[PDB]
mmCIF file of all heavy atoms in Angstrom:
data_model
loop_
_atom_site.group_PDB
_atom_site.id
_atom_site.type_symbol
_atom_site.label_atom_id
_atom_site.label_comp_id
_atom_site.label_asym_id
_atom_site.label_seq_id
_atom_site.Cartn_x
_atom_site.Cartn_y
_atom_site.Cartn_z
ATOM 1 N N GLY G 1 113.651 51.788 -113.125
ATOM 2 C CA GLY G 1 115.026 52.145 -113.391
ATOM 3 C C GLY G 1 115.761 52.656 -112.147
ATOM 4 O O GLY G 1 116.077 51.916 -111.292
ATOM 5 N N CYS G 2 116.046 53.989 -112.241
ATOM 6 C CA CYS G 2 116.731 54.677 -111.072
ATOM 7 C C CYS G 2 115.794 55.598 -110.457
ATOM 8 O O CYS G 2 115.708 55.617 -109.154
ATOM 9 C CB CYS G 2 118.018 55.426 -111.600
ATOM 10 S SG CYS G 2 117.591 56.541 -113.009
ATOM 11 N N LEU G 3 114.985 56.469 -111.213
ATOM 12 C CA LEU G 3 114.109 57.342 -110.552
ATOM 13 C C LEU G 3 112.969 57.626 -111.593
ATOM 14 O O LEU G 3 113.147 57.867 -112.800
ATOM 15 C CB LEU G 3 114.794 58.655 -110.186
ATOM 16 C CG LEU G 3 115.540 58.554 -108.773
ATOM 17 C CD1 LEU G 3 117.068 58.528 -109.104
ATOM 18 C CD2 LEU G 3 115.195 59.691 -107.952
ATOM 19 N N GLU G 4 111.827 57.620 -111.040
ATOM 20 C CA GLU G 4 110.596 57.861 -111.881
ATOM 21 C C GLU G 4 110.387 59.379 -112.159
ATOM 22 O O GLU G 4 111.171 60.175 -111.643
ATOM 23 C CB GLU G 4 109.388 57.261 -111.184
ATOM 24 C CG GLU G 4 108.410 56.571 -112.127
ATOM 25 C CD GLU G 4 107.592 55.495 -111.493
ATOM 26 O OE1 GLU G 4 106.659 55.928 -110.681
ATOM 27 O OE2 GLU G 4 107.812 54.336 -111.780
ATOM 28 N N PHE G 5 109.261 59.691 -112.766
ATOM 29 C CA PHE G 5 108.961 61.049 -113.223
ATOM 30 C C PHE G 5 108.932 61.947 -111.968
ATOM 31 O O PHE G 5 108.860 61.424 -110.846
ATOM 32 C CB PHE G 5 107.661 61.068 -113.913
ATOM 33 C CG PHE G 5 107.017 62.467 -114.069
ATOM 34 C CD1 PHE G 5 107.321 63.208 -115.189
ATOM 35 C CD2 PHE G 5 106.132 62.947 -113.067
ATOM 36 C CE1 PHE G 5 106.773 64.461 -115.330
ATOM 37 C CE2 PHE G 5 105.665 64.200 -113.192
ATOM 38 C CZ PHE G 5 105.914 64.989 -114.301
ATOM 39 N N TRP G 6 108.923 63.198 -112.197
ATOM 40 C CA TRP G 6 108.957 64.252 -111.138
ATOM 41 C C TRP G 6 110.256 64.240 -110.374
ATOM 42 O O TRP G 6 110.941 65.231 -110.302
ATOM 43 C CB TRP G 6 107.724 63.988 -110.166
ATOM 44 C CG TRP G 6 107.632 65.018 -109.131
ATOM 45 C CD1 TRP G 6 108.513 65.307 -108.135
ATOM 46 C CD2 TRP G 6 106.612 65.995 -109.035
ATOM 47 N NE1 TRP G 6 107.995 66.344 -107.259
ATOM 48 C CE2 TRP G 6 106.930 66.756 -107.882
ATOM 49 C CE3 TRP G 6 105.490 66.286 -109.714
ATOM 50 C CZ2 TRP G 6 106.021 67.841 -107.383
ATOM 51 C CZ3 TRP G 6 104.647 67.313 -109.268
ATOM 52 C CH2 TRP G 6 104.970 68.015 -108.147
ATOM 53 N N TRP G 7 110.639 63.122 -109.725
ATOM 54 C CA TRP G 7 111.846 63.045 -108.945
ATOM 55 C C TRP G 7 113.007 63.760 -109.616
ATOM 56 O O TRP G 7 113.589 63.341 -110.630
ATOM 57 C CB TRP G 7 112.226 61.464 -108.757
ATOM 58 C CG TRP G 7 111.334 60.743 -107.794
ATOM 59 C CD1 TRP G 7 110.212 61.299 -107.146
ATOM 60 C CD2 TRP G 7 111.270 59.402 -107.460
ATOM 61 N NE1 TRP G 7 109.598 60.348 -106.459
ATOM 62 C CE2 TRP G 7 110.168 59.103 -106.585
ATOM 63 C CE3 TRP G 7 112.149 58.330 -107.942
ATOM 64 C CZ2 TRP G 7 110.000 57.925 -106.125
ATOM 65 C CZ3 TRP G 7 111.923 57.100 -107.409
ATOM 66 C CH2 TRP G 7 110.790 56.842 -106.501
ATOM 67 N N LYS G 8 113.348 64.939 -109.034
ATOM 68 C CA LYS G 8 114.357 65.785 -109.455
ATOM 69 C C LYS G 8 115.576 64.897 -109.940
ATOM 70 O O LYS G 8 115.790 63.841 -109.496
ATOM 71 C CB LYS G 8 114.779 66.868 -108.405
ATOM 72 C CG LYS G 8 116.011 67.659 -108.789
ATOM 73 C CD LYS G 8 115.946 68.972 -107.993
ATOM 74 C CE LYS G 8 117.355 69.710 -108.223
ATOM 75 N NZ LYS G 8 117.305 71.018 -107.456
ATOM 76 N N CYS G 9 116.392 65.575 -110.873
ATOM 77 C CA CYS G 9 117.606 64.935 -111.324
ATOM 78 C C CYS G 9 118.782 65.831 -111.307
ATOM 79 O O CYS G 9 118.634 67.076 -110.979
ATOM 80 C CB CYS G 9 117.369 64.394 -112.664
ATOM 81 S SG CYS G 9 116.264 65.360 -113.777
ATOM 82 N N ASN G 10 119.951 65.398 -111.876
ATOM 83 C CA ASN G 10 121.154 66.217 -111.875
ATOM 84 C C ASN G 10 121.822 66.019 -113.289
ATOM 85 O O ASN G 10 121.737 64.928 -113.825
ATOM 86 C CB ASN G 10 122.107 65.957 -110.736
ATOM 87 C CG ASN G 10 122.238 67.161 -109.843
ATOM 88 O OD1 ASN G 10 121.951 68.237 -110.169
ATOM 89 N ND2 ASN G 10 122.766 66.827 -108.572
ATOM 90 N N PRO G 11 122.474 67.103 -113.867
ATOM 91 C CA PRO G 11 123.203 67.097 -115.041
ATOM 92 C C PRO G 11 124.475 66.275 -115.055
ATOM 93 O O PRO G 11 125.166 66.041 -115.966
ATOM 94 C CB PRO G 11 123.399 68.471 -115.366
ATOM 95 C CG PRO G 11 123.517 69.181 -114.112
ATOM 96 C CD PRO G 11 122.572 68.451 -113.233
ATOM 97 N N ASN G 12 124.836 65.900 -113.784
ATOM 98 C CA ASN G 12 126.076 65.167 -113.549
ATOM 99 C C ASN G 12 125.842 63.650 -113.498
ATOM 100 O O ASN G 12 126.573 62.811 -114.050
ATOM 101 C CB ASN G 12 126.821 65.637 -112.300
ATOM 102 C CG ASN G 12 127.570 66.912 -112.487
ATOM 103 O OD1 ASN G 12 127.097 67.861 -113.273
ATOM 104 N ND2 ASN G 12 128.684 67.056 -111.882
ATOM 105 N N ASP G 13 124.872 63.250 -112.722
ATOM 106 C CA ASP G 13 124.476 61.883 -112.514
ATOM 107 C C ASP G 13 123.159 61.540 -113.284
ATOM 108 O O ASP G 13 123.088 60.357 -113.783
ATOM 109 C CB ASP G 13 124.337 61.476 -111.080
ATOM 110 C CG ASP G 13 123.598 62.503 -110.291
ATOM 111 O OD1 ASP G 13 122.815 63.304 -110.955
ATOM 112 O OD2 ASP G 13 123.609 62.579 -109.100
ATOM 113 N N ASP G 14 122.284 62.430 -113.301
ATOM 114 C CA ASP G 14 121.004 62.272 -113.975
ATOM 115 C C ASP G 14 120.204 61.212 -113.282
ATOM 116 O O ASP G 14 120.711 60.131 -112.851
ATOM 117 C CB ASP G 14 121.203 61.818 -115.472
ATOM 118 C CG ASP G 14 119.914 61.957 -116.266
ATOM 119 O OD1 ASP G 14 119.388 63.052 -116.462
ATOM 120 O OD2 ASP G 14 119.343 60.820 -116.716
ATOM 121 N N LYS G 15 118.862 61.411 -113.021
ATOM 122 C CA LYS G 15 117.988 60.460 -112.407
ATOM 123 C C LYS G 15 116.949 59.995 -113.241
ATOM 124 O O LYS G 15 116.201 59.098 -113.043
ATOM 125 C CB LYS G 15 117.380 61.116 -111.237
ATOM 126 C CG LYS G 15 118.464 61.705 -110.221
ATOM 127 C CD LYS G 15 119.366 60.645 -109.750
ATOM 128 C CE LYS G 15 120.885 61.108 -109.832
ATOM 129 N NZ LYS G 15 121.661 60.757 -108.672
ATOM 130 N N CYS G 16 116.806 60.607 -114.540
ATOM 131 C CA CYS G 16 115.761 60.135 -115.432
ATOM 132 C C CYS G 16 116.233 58.945 -116.249
ATOM 133 O O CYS G 16 117.003 58.925 -117.064
ATOM 134 C CB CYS G 16 115.520 61.317 -116.488
ATOM 135 S SG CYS G 16 115.137 62.935 -115.774
ATOM 136 N N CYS G 17 115.531 57.807 -115.861
ATOM 137 C CA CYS G 17 115.907 56.496 -116.459
ATOM 138 C C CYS G 17 114.804 56.119 -117.410
ATOM 139 O O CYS G 17 115.046 55.314 -118.371
ATOM 140 C CB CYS G 17 116.025 55.458 -115.407
ATOM 141 S SG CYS G 17 117.737 55.357 -114.699
ATOM 142 N N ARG G 18 113.601 56.700 -117.284
ATOM 143 C CA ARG G 18 112.496 56.336 -118.210
ATOM 144 C C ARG G 18 112.848 56.678 -119.670
ATOM 145 O O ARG G 18 113.341 57.735 -119.879
ATOM 146 C CB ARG G 18 111.189 57.010 -117.696
ATOM 147 C CG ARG G 18 110.164 56.044 -117.198
ATOM 148 C CD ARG G 18 110.100 56.022 -115.607
ATOM 149 N NE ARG G 18 108.808 56.647 -115.223
ATOM 150 C CZ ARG G 18 107.604 56.041 -115.426
ATOM 151 N NH1 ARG G 18 107.489 54.941 -116.095
ATOM 152 N NH2 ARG G 18 106.556 56.642 -114.921
ATOM 153 N N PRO G 19 112.429 55.871 -120.650
ATOM 154 C CA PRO G 19 112.656 56.164 -121.997
ATOM 155 C C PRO G 19 112.140 57.553 -122.466
ATOM 156 O O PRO G 19 112.531 58.063 -123.449
ATOM 157 C CB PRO G 19 111.915 55.015 -122.713
ATOM 158 C CG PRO G 19 111.782 53.986 -121.723
ATOM 159 C CD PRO G 19 111.688 54.613 -120.365
ATOM 160 N N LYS G 20 111.257 58.079 -121.645
ATOM 161 C CA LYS G 20 110.711 59.349 -122.005
ATOM 162 C C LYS G 20 111.021 60.396 -120.986
ATOM 163 O O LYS G 20 110.867 61.601 -121.275
ATOM 164 C CB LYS G 20 109.196 59.192 -122.163
ATOM 165 C CG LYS G 20 108.335 60.107 -121.229
ATOM 166 C CD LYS G 20 107.544 59.225 -120.178
ATOM 167 C CE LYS G 20 108.615 58.383 -119.362
ATOM 168 N NZ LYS G 20 108.569 56.991 -119.764
ATOM 169 N N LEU G 21 111.576 59.982 -119.794
ATOM 170 C CA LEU G 21 111.910 60.924 -118.751
ATOM 171 C C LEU G 21 113.334 61.562 -119.098
ATOM 172 O O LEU G 21 114.188 61.061 -119.879
ATOM 173 C CB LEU G 21 112.096 60.211 -117.359
ATOM 174 C CG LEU G 21 110.752 60.059 -116.665
ATOM 175 C CD1 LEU G 21 111.002 59.507 -115.303
ATOM 176 C CD2 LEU G 21 110.040 61.416 -116.619
ATOM 177 N N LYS G 22 113.459 62.843 -118.659
ATOM 178 C CA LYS G 22 114.733 63.520 -118.949
ATOM 179 C C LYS G 22 114.701 64.885 -118.205
ATOM 180 O O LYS G 22 113.661 65.595 -118.177
ATOM 181 C CB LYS G 22 114.903 63.830 -120.419
ATOM 182 C CG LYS G 22 116.132 64.607 -120.791
ATOM 183 C CD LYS G 22 115.971 65.434 -121.918
ATOM 184 C CE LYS G 22 117.248 65.814 -122.550
ATOM 185 N NZ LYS G 22 117.086 67.059 -123.454
ATOM 186 N N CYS G 23 115.848 65.222 -117.575
ATOM 187 C CA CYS G 23 115.883 66.456 -116.834
ATOM 188 C C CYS G 23 115.626 67.727 -117.623
ATOM 189 O O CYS G 23 116.384 68.261 -118.385
ATOM 190 C CB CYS G 23 117.420 66.631 -116.297
ATOM 191 S SG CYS G 23 117.546 66.828 -114.514
ATOM 192 N N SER G 24 114.299 68.028 -117.568
ATOM 193 C CA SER G 24 113.785 69.134 -118.423
ATOM 194 C C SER G 24 113.968 70.487 -117.594
ATOM 195 O O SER G 24 114.137 70.409 -116.352
ATOM 196 C CB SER G 24 112.282 68.968 -118.781
ATOM 197 O OG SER G 24 111.837 70.009 -119.592
ATOM 198 N N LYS G 25 113.965 71.595 -118.378
ATOM 199 C CA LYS G 25 114.270 72.853 -117.793
ATOM 200 C C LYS G 25 112.898 73.472 -117.253
ATOM 201 O O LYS G 25 112.904 74.521 -116.748
ATOM 202 C CB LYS G 25 114.892 73.864 -118.837
ATOM 203 C CG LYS G 25 113.860 74.134 -120.000
ATOM 204 C CD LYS G 25 113.120 75.397 -119.747
ATOM 205 C CE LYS G 25 112.906 76.123 -121.097
ATOM 206 N NZ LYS G 25 114.028 77.109 -121.420
ATOM 207 N N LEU G 26 111.798 72.634 -117.308
ATOM 208 C CA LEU G 26 110.543 73.118 -116.808
ATOM 209 C C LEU G 26 110.568 73.573 -115.353
ATOM 210 O O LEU G 26 110.173 74.702 -115.008
ATOM 211 C CB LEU G 26 109.471 71.972 -117.082
ATOM 212 C CG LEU G 26 108.068 72.488 -117.396
ATOM 213 C CD1 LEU G 26 107.050 71.325 -117.533
ATOM 214 C CD2 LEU G 26 107.588 73.447 -116.324
ATOM 215 N N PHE G 27 111.191 72.662 -114.598
ATOM 216 C CA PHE G 27 111.307 72.927 -113.134
ATOM 217 C C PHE G 27 112.503 72.158 -112.515
ATOM 218 O O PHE G 27 112.611 72.004 -111.330
ATOM 219 C CB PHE G 27 110.075 72.559 -112.427
ATOM 220 C CG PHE G 27 109.320 71.366 -112.930
ATOM 221 C CD1 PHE G 27 109.986 70.325 -113.536
ATOM 222 C CD2 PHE G 27 107.905 71.251 -112.741
ATOM 223 C CE1 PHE G 27 109.333 69.298 -114.016
ATOM 224 C CE2 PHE G 27 107.319 70.129 -113.255
ATOM 225 C CZ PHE G 27 107.911 69.082 -113.859
ATOM 226 N N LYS G 28 113.394 71.709 -113.450
ATOM 227 C CA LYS G 28 114.580 70.928 -112.924
ATOM 228 C C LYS G 28 114.224 69.563 -112.426
ATOM 229 O O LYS G 28 114.670 69.080 -111.426
ATOM 230 C CB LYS G 28 115.388 71.723 -111.881
ATOM 231 C CG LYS G 28 115.669 73.184 -112.305
ATOM 232 C CD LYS G 28 117.119 73.568 -111.801
ATOM 233 C CE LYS G 28 117.835 74.400 -112.869
ATOM 234 N NZ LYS G 28 119.257 74.331 -112.556
ATOM 235 N N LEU G 29 113.220 68.939 -113.136
ATOM 236 C CA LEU G 29 112.854 67.620 -112.791
ATOM 237 C C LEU G 29 112.590 66.662 -113.884
ATOM 238 O O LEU G 29 112.497 67.155 -115.068
ATOM 239 C CB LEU G 29 111.572 67.708 -111.859
ATOM 240 C CG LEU G 29 111.745 68.058 -110.406
ATOM 241 C CD1 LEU G 29 112.187 69.600 -110.332
ATOM 242 C CD2 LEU G 29 110.477 67.846 -109.595
ATOM 243 N N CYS G 30 112.537 65.338 -113.673
ATOM 244 C CA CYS G 30 112.341 64.413 -114.782
ATOM 245 C C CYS G 30 110.959 64.590 -115.392
ATOM 246 O O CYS G 30 109.922 64.066 -114.946
ATOM 247 C CB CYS G 30 112.527 62.974 -114.229
ATOM 248 S SG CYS G 30 114.199 62.464 -113.977
ATOM 249 N N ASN G 31 110.951 65.422 -116.419
ATOM 250 C CA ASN G 31 109.624 65.716 -117.160
ATOM 251 C C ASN G 31 109.321 64.565 -118.165
ATOM 252 O O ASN G 31 110.221 63.894 -118.578
ATOM 253 C CB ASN G 31 109.700 67.080 -117.872
ATOM 254 C CG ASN G 31 108.317 67.620 -118.022
ATOM 255 O OD1 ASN G 31 107.677 67.518 -119.093
ATOM 256 N ND2 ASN G 31 107.896 68.498 -117.075
ATOM 257 N N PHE G 32 108.090 64.433 -118.484
ATOM 258 C CA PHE G 32 107.638 63.483 -119.488
ATOM 259 C C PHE G 32 108.121 63.900 -120.951
ATOM 260 O O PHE G 32 108.831 64.764 -121.042
ATOM 261 C CB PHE G 32 106.110 63.306 -119.423
ATOM 262 C CG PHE G 32 105.605 61.959 -119.033
ATOM 263 C CD1 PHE G 32 105.926 61.357 -117.872
ATOM 264 C CD2 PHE G 32 104.989 61.170 -120.012
ATOM 265 C CE1 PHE G 32 105.525 60.070 -117.498
ATOM 266 C CE2 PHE G 32 104.662 59.784 -119.663
ATOM 267 C CZ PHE G 32 104.836 59.315 -118.442
ATOM 268 N N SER G 33 107.473 63.128 -121.905
ATOM 269 C CA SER G 33 107.907 63.440 -123.356
ATOM 270 C C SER G 33 106.726 64.106 -124.082
ATOM 271 O O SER G 33 106.846 64.915 -124.909
ATOM 272 C CB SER G 33 108.305 62.135 -124.029
ATOM 273 O OG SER G 33 108.382 62.321 -125.385
ATOM 274 N N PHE G 34 105.482 63.587 -123.666
ATOM 275 C CA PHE G 34 104.259 64.122 -124.302
ATOM 276 C C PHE G 34 104.108 65.595 -124.092
ATOM 277 O O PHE G 34 103.972 66.298 -125.067
ATOM 278 C CB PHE G 34 103.093 63.348 -123.827
ATOM 279 C CG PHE G 34 103.069 61.892 -124.031
ATOM 280 C CD1 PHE G 34 103.047 60.995 -123.059
ATOM 281 C CD2 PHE G 34 103.151 61.379 -125.383
ATOM 282 C CE1 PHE G 34 103.064 59.660 -123.279
ATOM 283 C CE2 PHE G 34 103.148 60.017 -125.637
ATOM 284 C CZ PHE G 34 103.084 59.138 -124.606
#
């Protein structure tokens, strides 16, 4: 997609493209779903 897991993201553009990826508050990066 645009950016894989780990690869930090932003709440304005977002980099999490994976169906399970999403800017998590864990460390401000595309965290998994599991």
Side-chain angles (χ1 to χ4, degrees):
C2 51
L3 281 107
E4 222 155 68
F5 168 88
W6 183 294
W7 289 357
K8 176 160 167 175
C9 37
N10 245 343
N12 279 39
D13 47 16
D14 193 69
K15 307 298 130 142
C16 307
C17 274
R18 248 105 111 65
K20 121 252 54 253
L21 279 187
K22 181 215 200 197
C23 238
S24 189
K25 64 97 145 267
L26 214 182
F27 37 28
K28 306 220 141 201
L29 280 70
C30 284
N31 206 270
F32 240 65
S33 169
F34 299 120

